[PDB]
Design a protein around this motif. Sequence first.
Motif, short mmCIF file in Angstrom:
data_model
loop_
_atom_site.label_atom_id
_atom_site.label_comp_id
_atom_site.label_asym_id
_atom_site.label_seq_id
_atom_site.Cartn_x
_atom_site.Cartn_y
_atom_site.Cartn_z
N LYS A 436 -3.95 -4.30 8.66
CA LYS A 436 -4.51 -5.42 9.88
C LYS A 436 -3.28 -6.03 10.53
O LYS A 436 -2.90 -6.17 11.42
CB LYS A 436 -5.87 -5.65 10.17
N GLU A 437 -2.75 -7.09 9.17
CA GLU A 437 -1.81 -8.34 9.39
C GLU A 437 -1.30 -7.31 9.63
O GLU A 437 0.90 -8.13 10.23
CB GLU A 437 -2.09 -9.39 8.59
N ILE A 438 -0.22 -6.57 8.55
CA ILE A 438 1.15 -5.67 8.71
C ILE A 438 0.81 -4.87 10.09
O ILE A 438 2.33 -5.67 11.04
CB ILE A 438 1.16 -4.25 7.91
N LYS A 439 0.00 -4.13 10.27
CA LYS A 439 0.50 -3.37 11.89
C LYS A 439 0.69 -4.38 12.86
O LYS A 439 1.36 -4.50 13.88
CB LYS A 439 -1.16 -3.28 12.71
N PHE A 450 7.99 -3.21 8.65
CA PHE A 450 7.36 -2.08 7.42
C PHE A 450 6.13 -1.57 8.36
O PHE A 450 6.25 -2.07 9.55
CB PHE A 450 7.14 -3.10 6.58
N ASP A 451 6.04 -0.48 7.44
CA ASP A 451 4.86 0.15 8.78
C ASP A 451 3.84 0.81 7.54
O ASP A 451 4.22 0.80 6.58
CB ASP A 451 4.93 1.43 9.49
N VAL A 490 -2.13 0.78 -1.54
CA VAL A 490 -1.59 0.76 -0.24
C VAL A 490 -0.07 1.14 -0.63
O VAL A 490 0.42 0.24 -1.61
CB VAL A 490 -1.67 -1.27 0.40
N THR A 491 0.31 2.55 0.00
CA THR A 491 1.58 1.92 -0.31
C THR A 491 2.60 1.75 1.36
O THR A 491 2.05 1.95 2.18
CB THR A 491 2.20 4.11 0.01
N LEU A 492 3.74 0.92 1.03
CA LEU A 492 4.00 0.29 2.39
C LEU A 492 5.77 0.77 1.93
O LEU A 492 6.03 1.37 0.91
CB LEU A 492 4.77 -1.20 1.47
#
Lengths: 710, 710, 237
Positions: A436-439, A450-451, A490-492
């Motif tokens: 949720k922090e990346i989003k 990044f997504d 987790v794939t970045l």
Amino acid sequence: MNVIAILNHMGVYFKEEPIRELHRALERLNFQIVYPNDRDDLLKLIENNARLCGVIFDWDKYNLELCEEISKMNENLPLYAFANTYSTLDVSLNDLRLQISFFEYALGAAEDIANKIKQTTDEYINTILPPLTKALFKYVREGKYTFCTPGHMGGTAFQKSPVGSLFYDFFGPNTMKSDISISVSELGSLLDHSGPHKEAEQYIARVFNADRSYMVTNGTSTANKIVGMYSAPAGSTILIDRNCHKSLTHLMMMSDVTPIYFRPTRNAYGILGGIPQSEFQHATIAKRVKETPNATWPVHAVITNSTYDGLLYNTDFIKKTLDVKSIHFDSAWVPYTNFSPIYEGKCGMSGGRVEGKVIYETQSTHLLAAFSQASMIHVKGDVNEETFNEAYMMHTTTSPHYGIVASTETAAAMMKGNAGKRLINGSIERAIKFRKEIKRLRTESDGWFFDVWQPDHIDTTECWPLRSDSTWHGFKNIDNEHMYLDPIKVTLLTPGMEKDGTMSDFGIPASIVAKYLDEHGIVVEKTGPYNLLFLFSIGIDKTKALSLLRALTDFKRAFDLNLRVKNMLPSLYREDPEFYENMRIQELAQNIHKLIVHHNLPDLMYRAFEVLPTMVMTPYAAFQKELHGMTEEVYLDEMVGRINANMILPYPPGVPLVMPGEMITEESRPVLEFLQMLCEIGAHYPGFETDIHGAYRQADGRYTVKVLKE
Amino acid sequence: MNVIAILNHMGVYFKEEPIRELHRALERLNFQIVYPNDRDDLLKLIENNARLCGVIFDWDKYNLELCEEISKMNENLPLYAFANTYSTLDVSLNDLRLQISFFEYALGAAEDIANKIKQTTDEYINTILPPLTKALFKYVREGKYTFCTPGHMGGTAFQKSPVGSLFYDFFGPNTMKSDISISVSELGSLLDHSGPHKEAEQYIARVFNADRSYMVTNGTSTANKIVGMYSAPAGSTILIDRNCHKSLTHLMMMSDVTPIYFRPTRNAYGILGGIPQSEFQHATIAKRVKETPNATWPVHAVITNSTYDGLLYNTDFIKKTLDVKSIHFDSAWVPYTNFSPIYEGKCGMSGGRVEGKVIYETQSTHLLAAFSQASMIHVKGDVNEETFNEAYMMHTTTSPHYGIVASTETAAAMMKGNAGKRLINGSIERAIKFRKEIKRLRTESDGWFFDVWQPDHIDTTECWPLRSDSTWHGFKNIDNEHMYLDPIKVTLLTPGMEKDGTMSDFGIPASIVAKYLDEHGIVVEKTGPYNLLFLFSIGIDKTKALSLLRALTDFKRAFDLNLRVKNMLPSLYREDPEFYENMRIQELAQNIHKLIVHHNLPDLMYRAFEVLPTMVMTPYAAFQKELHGMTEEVYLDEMVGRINANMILPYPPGVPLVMPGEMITEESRPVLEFLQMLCEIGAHYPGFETDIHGAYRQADGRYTVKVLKE
Amino acid sequence: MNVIAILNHMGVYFKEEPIRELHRALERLNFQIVYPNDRDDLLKLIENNARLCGVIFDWDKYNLELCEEISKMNENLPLYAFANTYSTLDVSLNDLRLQISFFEYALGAAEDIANKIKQTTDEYINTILPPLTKALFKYVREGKYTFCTPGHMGGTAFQKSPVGSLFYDFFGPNTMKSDISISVSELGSLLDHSGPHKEAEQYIARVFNADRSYMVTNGTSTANKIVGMYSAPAGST
């Protein structure tokens, strides 16, 4: 383990003075006392501190407010409850398991109560420690045998040499003393599976839901060969995942077997998809058995469950559908499935026996916590149990290290019960938070970011289903109710591709992020042109997530400032000062990305692995010839139409491209073209070299391989 | 390593006061100062104490009396010499290698000299430590990489669990921290043999006189199979010592090879004698190749050198005589031959290459000091060096433990130079002393005593020759200038046989001495009816020899007093109180010895192993059938005329009696009779049971074996 | 540079006790701890005191109120932030450059965290010091060459005379030891403008916006004459 917490001022001398007398007596009895700030801190201390090993409190002040709360945290934790006259036990306590010692506030009991607490702590230690390790530690503490081997006798030989004394002193006595042999007869024997070792095996099988469990100290490489040589006689046909480990090549070279391959699917992203249902069905298997010379119905299959990217099989479907009597799930990726309800129906051991079939899991204990080389064989079904041990003993070492064995058994002791259930829950909660922090930062950041490759909703705890009617995963014609995303893998994704799988005008190759992370000591599990993988294990705490999160935003910030390579990557600079003297990070990125676009790398990489070279002979047959010296070297360019002698394993993408006995043709030229292209493109930038195992770079950038003679 | 010795009162304040200022400054700089009593104590301190790491002395007072004496002990030991005006260097020093720092007695140099000594000590440490270990220790001290696997991150995962914290705290940080992976790129790679690993291999090969050396961490069991599968293709003929390890059975079961066996000799004592010269000669080999179906000239031989009882081969004779291109000395017993001049011409690696032949030693490092599973392959001659590594990598684990590897490399670092030469000399001197002590007590004791099986003179340092014209060894028609007694392998003989090899009226079976030593925690390497073996390793100090010597005289004394079994062997008593309630040690000895005489055990044991069962099929062919379930169990009695499925390995004498595929007949009934007799005689005394691996004792004392179906 | 400031009483033993264990371990690790009166004093301490070289604080208690304020003062200053479960990074932090080490409140990490702080401080020192001076100081601390000139060898000749010892003792060892020659080959050469001296010149020219910069140690009196004799031949105007 000597810190005792006291939680209180009670406002009355008649209570406080005996507690003073006890504090003082306890400090003189060699305990460290600690004092949580208050009730809320205590619950956090317990939750955060394993060395806190007892709590002293006034019964009335705290029981109706604490009992269930503490029982949720640790149902054996010593409680030292000080009772009043009217203190009693309410019926609400009936269903709780509590280990309680009741004490009164009275002078004259100090030495006695102190000894009880000390004694009760040792009694508790005895419950939690497993039986063999308990006997071993007790031996190292108390035992005194003379006229014994090993000749070094608790490291004694090391102390005769200054250099040996440094090694002894660096690792410490326990490491040296716990290096024992079967001369310690009361621990039974690993190789006989006797005494406490019997108890150990029953313990493991009980927790892991197996019928039988073997402890292997030379990795699943060795577990595979024990199962293989017992399971797959010469001349037999086996079904084997084309996605195979090198140790299975070493088996094939040693055993005269005929393989038929399960064939994974793949999508435009390059993400592996599962063996489609068609591959398991009688009609498909019959067709391949029909087309393969000397093949009979398969007697042994080996499937890798789950897939790497978290697509778990409906194991109920496979066990029912695959008409093979002996199925070996190489479940190296999912050692934890027995411990979350979300994996029910999605692991090898789930449920009960499979009627008419033996099912194996071989597991690489070392996605859990254990020393390298620790591996288990879990059997669900019947074999010749004693004969299987003859095969085990023929391939087992006679120099077993008792520390490695203890570290494997101690990793299990750790996962035991509730607390090991809540340990993994913690890592899931942090994965979801970080997701949720990346989003959020994606929305809030300046332009690109990044997504995370995932569904649009992830507010739920589950392995999210991937469906043919969904677009987010990017795979083509996917089976439904088949694959599921594991929250912890987790794939970045780095910038560089469009939603199409076509190339963006702006790109940042991931290889550059790897170099940046290397200056900062961060390990990357696996990298591809535009992808990077991170494992959110029980290792990864909030401190590392914060440093990683900030490190990732810093890479972006630093990239967009256009820092000098000289300044941002000094070790890279030193590899070619002139080449790198004035170059800035964006120029490095631009040039490499432009090369990628120019050489059409993604299209060529995709197409290279979409066909298969042709099998001329088996690796075994080729190795027999090799054993007689019937090989020659030729340049890589000269290999079309010739029978390859060695495996050729290129990086990227890190999976076999040509086997011994195979031959590239014109039909399969994309294989060779990809390999030659990697050699060519890789010559330009110092620090960005080609990487092919079993190939020999020459001074002029040409590669040699080995082939069979005629 | 912080103890500094000062050796002196000089009688002058002008010298003593600066030394006081230095003492005080050094103590404040965190050194422990020690003070030998005098010059003679100093030389003994150095000789006995490895933690003493520097000597401070007045140059004139001590140099002409000390220089050469200290140089003999340790040619790098820091000397801190305080000079006078007239101090100079005499030409006699020319040929000595000395590492000397010269210092003056002056105030104001304390912090500076202290830092130099500290710095110079670290500089010395850097010379003596090997390069990879040096980098590893430095990493553990200084390094700080984040975003790394292993997930436990220096044992971090262990600290989340009380039980894990106990295991962590017991073994200690160093053990946990030195558990690393190839992520530490600056140490190169074991599997690539690159960087510091290259340097390590060159170091080992340089010291051990090899062309090439491999570090194996799964024992010589694994080294054998790597050499085997590379060396012995299917259908080949090999010469193999009938004295073979189980791991070579596991190889034979996996590879379709045809063996012809070298055949040891034996004497009336039951001591193995060497393969006689006849077995190596072209005429003998041709005759066996002639008589063995499908056999061609051997392409690979495996000899065990030395023999167990110290008969070393004239290796010059074997290398010249045995017309085989590939000879593998399994030199597991003599890893130290390169380090004494007495073994020249008597070891595999001695001298230079063997023209036209590759010679192997496989060695079990773990008769030296190293962790179990440590093994080396030493190659003398040419193979396909890179291809040999492909075979190595197929059978090597991917979870190497970096501690096990360091312990194997650190065992070499210990043996380095002079001091490692004098270390083994010490163990030889004690063996010879102890040998003479037995002889003395033999004369001086009351009646019977132990004897040492050895020549009449042993006042000389050499491996004593055994000759056909000598009687002491008891072997029949021995080859001359062939076998030699190793001083360090000491065979003690218990009463019970005459000089004839016939039985004495008085006997004490050795099994009873073993039980006695077990109550006292003393380990016995190997026992036979009237023999016991002790290894005088670099482990065995004067303290253990004294305790053993006295323990042995105590056994005699206690036996001759006729102590109650209840009192002398309480653990044995508890096995059957009624059986043992009133029995005295002599009555136990008498009854067991009488049983031995009655059942004619020695004559039957001797004759059992003097013939060979008949080979019907190979173990491989039998195992293929087993893999298909083509086996049944029958009682041991029912096995004549049937094809055995399992190896049958009885104790005593601890060597294979029947192989899979062999058959007992009437011609070879003594084999079965010995086995049945062991089962029968062993039923009488609790604590004195039969012991046969691959046999299943039933409630009525009958045994089952596995056979091939028809 | 050994003063560490702690800014707090948190009101809970579960937090305060690990900080006590750390205070005590840090004092035993040879740090001086200092205690600003409060948040406002801390910002003034940092602003006024160069020897204050790290700040320990509770993340939630202070970050949204301190981050940008401290970053304005010194963007490398070591921050030792103690996190809670719900602590996270708000998107507002994106554009700030922060050098942060995150630590948890737990027993058993003292010697390890202490060594990291000590090590991280030395790592920071390495960033801020310029490359030649860094090598020079490191040589004076560690080096040990013998058979060397200058003949005085780190001021050794001064100590043979009472008057020389006064001069040595007045100015101190560093002044005497840092008096070196080109025998220290790894510093390159001023006169050849080579190695670290090359890096020094590029550093200066980079900061001062020059194409090229020369280091002159005999004043602009000498710089004028070098430029003059190269620039103004005889007979020129």
